[PDB]
RNA sequence: AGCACCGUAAAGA
């Protein structure tokens, strides 16, 4: 089993500091700085931050779990400057793209030596500091680019975003791939299992790591409830953490007695001078309709309106004269004049950046935003209101999770300006003190990993000789997290000192999980030509590895069965839209033969893959796999590639625009990848075809610049 | 030619699902993307090293690629540009793995870990590249008392 | 209250849119003959790129412009 | 929470 030694240090109240180190190396604590400081700060650093800096000085990796808005980004800048002092290179992994652009703008303002990498652009890569997403770094680690041998400091933001299902593999794999001679920082939110994470990093790098945890916060919050029609906000918990359910009981009584509302709430808020306010509604039509309702009011002067017109024009002047004549632009601009804004992943990103900037200024007070602000921005406010607790994620129409409740509440509270922040929660249902308590005061949800094996992983790992998957699985978090749950039946057996479990769980104490899926993936790869006996690659593998933005087995089969070799330029774009697009729509479309026929061959190949998957028992279903690919935008993309107008396009489908933009950007990425694949096998007509399609897509707005850049 | 698929090289034909290729019996090493490799150096250019594989061009090891003594990794400066010679003499041998293949045909190769790099004294043989099975773990350590 | 913008915003790009010497022998003197090798000062010449009744009217407006 | 589907009672012409 993994031997590991964890320890605590004698410090003062304000935080908690604990180390995790190899089980056979004694502990000699950190040492004070030597010489000048890397970056002097105008103010005085908390114990939290100065401990982080003291750790970063002695060249030791760290974990930092503290609520947002606590200047958690200081350790990052210190590390960056320290690296730029020793000629080293440093890296900053931010999954989001817009957050990455913001961090790049900041680091560029400050240090003048930075470089951005992202799916859309690339800047000054010969920079001692590289800001970018994580998947880029994954591809690097695979292809051992010229960076891993130079960068000594990595810094991760939003590891808690690893708790998801579709992307929690990336951060893990990246960590497993980094070399022992690296150092790096983790900047998370509150998570109670930090000790396990640190032990994992240690046993994984044979390196010591530090952990800082604190509930500290500069702007304490006050939570209130609003029941339907109560016309009165009821306190529940106070700054001091004193939860008083007396008012909560009164609120429930009002609920029971009850048997154009959020408007009333915002009017209250503004009469209280509690502005500005954020509004978290877990949908899109609701946000938009609330904005429509509240258009009547005005929370700005006239000079502010002229100034907003100025900035808005200076921003959307980068577009054409026609994209200006777009219904969203017009039908929104007055809402911005009036001081209310809306933000959700269904807009054009131009207006999104515009609104985020305006909010950073203060030219809009009430903002209807669902979950974007919750994660990837530093733009706090004075008060926040939850339109309702319920939401949708994955499949379940679950209640709100304390983790997300707090991730959003952290928004409220502007340092300096606001002596405190006002959270409010709307309710229209009986909710006894248990659920309300575990929601409001309950602690965050732990950081469990997903670590679902994937094709790309297996193939890109078969390329290599020194690294094999079994290693990956035995080094992951999903495995290291199955050694503190082991003592249970092990303790039962120790008592027994039943024996069936003894034999089995003793031969399964330090063993591997999730192997059967690995063997089945291998079997598929063999049956389809993507590998061979002896577990070695085949041409198909070196064609699929180049693809990462979609299902690559089926793309390679489409190639090696001769589909794109007979079609035209755009039809390929459409058949790829059939993959990037993953949303449902109301009305399935009617498609012409020239454009539909190919999809039938696509579905035949899909059925073949499904049968080959079922033979090996991947617990897979056929109907889903086949229907997981929505062609609802084939005609959209066709007409777009014919060189048409975005307004002549947003109509054909009852879908928002931002989804189209995401579709098309992923599509262009996939086209670059397919060009490289054709470049690999040896064909040229196909790569010219795909490149021409790319040249057809990018016209006006799907690939505009980021105002933050 | 004239809507007719005409061979170009002597060997056996191979028909993958819809792709028709040929697998000659003697060729010079075409560059793959993960294949390990052994190479004898030929030149030392201001920026990089030029290496000789049984390839149709002069393989390339960028100064950025070669690992450094131990793990003392900060960045590459002019001092490294001048040690570019005193460490990797012209004529020496390197056991690397490919990094990428350029459109001009050349092969840029690197050193993923410390198991790779420069080689000791040992001995060497030069055979044809079409006589090594494409498989895994080219690095063997045999019971006879040696390694290959 | 507030009336004006901020600077961090006002920085973005979409928004902005020896010695001497006196030789009495050669103080107030100037060259009397100068060596040139250009046939333009020498001689007047039209504009190279031209056009006749239709080809590339852009060159026609260039003719109208530069030949006066 | 919502959108859709089905049935049910009532009013006018
Ligand atoms: N410890 C601190 N004391 C005072 N102001 C601080 C402190 N930490 C951060 N700030 C202020 O917070 C501003 C930006 O906050 P923000 O970027 O949201 O912090 P974060 O931890 O990175 N999230 C800075 O410009 C500072 O003025």
From Swiss-Prot, chain A:
Belongs to the helicase family. SKI2 subfamily. One of its GO terms (biological process) is mRNA splicing, via spliceosome. It is found in: Nucleus, Nucleoplasm; Nucleus, Nucleolus; Nucleus; Nucleus speckle. Its main location: nucleus. Gene3D superfamilies: 1.10.3380.30, 2.40.30.300, P-loop containing nucleotide triphosphate hydrolases. It comes from the Eukaryota. Pfam families: DEAD (PF00270), DSHCT (PF08148), Helicase_C (PF00271), MTR4-like_stalk (PF21408), MTR4_beta-barrel (PF13234). Activated when MTREX is incorporated into NEXT complex an the nuclear RNA exosome complex. It catalyses: ATP + H2O = ADP + phosphate + H(+). ATP binds at residues 44, 66-73. This is Exosome RNA helicase MTR4. SUPFAM superfamilies: P-loop containing nucleoside triphosphate hydrolases. Its EC number is 3.6.4.13.
UniProtKB/Swiss-Prot annotation, chain B:
The modification Phosphoserine is found at residue 77. GO terms for molecular function: 3'-5'-RNA exonuclease activity; 7S RNA binding; RNA binding. One of its GO terms (cellular component) is cytoplasm. Its main location: cytoplasm. It is found in: Cytoplasm; Nucleus, Nucleolus; Nucleus. It comes from the Eukaryota. Residues 32-112 form the S1 motif domain. Belongs to the RRP4 family. It is linked to Short stature, hearing loss, retinitis pigmentosa, and distinctive facies: An autosomal recessive disorder characterized by childhood myopia, early onset retinitis pigmentosa, progressive sensorineural hearing loss, hypothyroidism, short stature, brachydactyly, recognisable facial gestalt, premature ageing and mild intellectual disability. Disulfide bonds: none annotated. Component of the RNA exosome core complex (Exo-9), composed of EXOSC1, EXOSC2, EXOSC3, EXOSC4, EXOSC5, EXOSC6, EXOSC7, EXOSC8 and EXOSC9; within the complex interacts with EXOSC4 and EXOSC7. The catalytically inactive RNA exosome core complex (Exo-9) associates with the catalytic subunit EXOSC10/RRP6. Exo-9 may associate with DIS3 to form the nucleolar exosome complex, or DIS3L to form the cytoplasmic exosome complex. Exo-9 is formed by a hexameric base ring consisting of the heterodimers EXOSC4-EXOSC9, EXOSC5-EXOSC8 and EXOSC6-EXOSC7, and a cap ring consisting of EXOSC1, EXOSC2 and EXOSC3. Keywords: Cytoplasm, Deafness, Disease variant, Dwarfism, Exosome, Nucleus, Phosphoprotein, Retinitis pigmentosa, RNA-binding, rRNA processing. GO terms for biological process: CUT catabolic process; exonucleolytic trimming to generate mature 3'-end of 5.8S rRNA from tricistronic rRNA transcript (SSU-rRNA, 5.8S rRNA, LSU-rRNA); nuclear polyadenylation-dependent rRNA catabolic process; nuclear-transcribed mRNA catabolic process; poly(A)-dependent snoRNA 3'-end processing; positive regulation of cell growth; RNA catabolic process; RNA processing. It comes from Homo sapiens (Human). The keyword RNA-binding applies. This is Exosome complex component RRP4.
From Swiss-Prot, chain C:
There is a cross-link at residue 61 (Glycyl lysine isopeptide (Lys-Gly) (interchain with G-Cter in SUMO2)). Phosphorylated in M (mitotic) phase. It is found in: Nucleus, Nucleolus; Cytoplasm. RNA-binding protein that associates with the RNA exosome complex. Involved in the 3'-processing of the 7S pre-RNA to the mature 5.8S rRNA and play a role in recruiting the RNA exosome complex to pre-rRNA; this function may include C1D. Associates with the RNA exosome complex, mediated by EXOSC3. Interacts with ARHGAP18. Interacts with exosome cofactors EXOSC10 and MTREX. Belongs to the MPP6 family. This is M-phase phosphoprotein 6. It comes from Homo sapiens (Human). The chain holds residues 5 to 93 of 160 of the full protein.
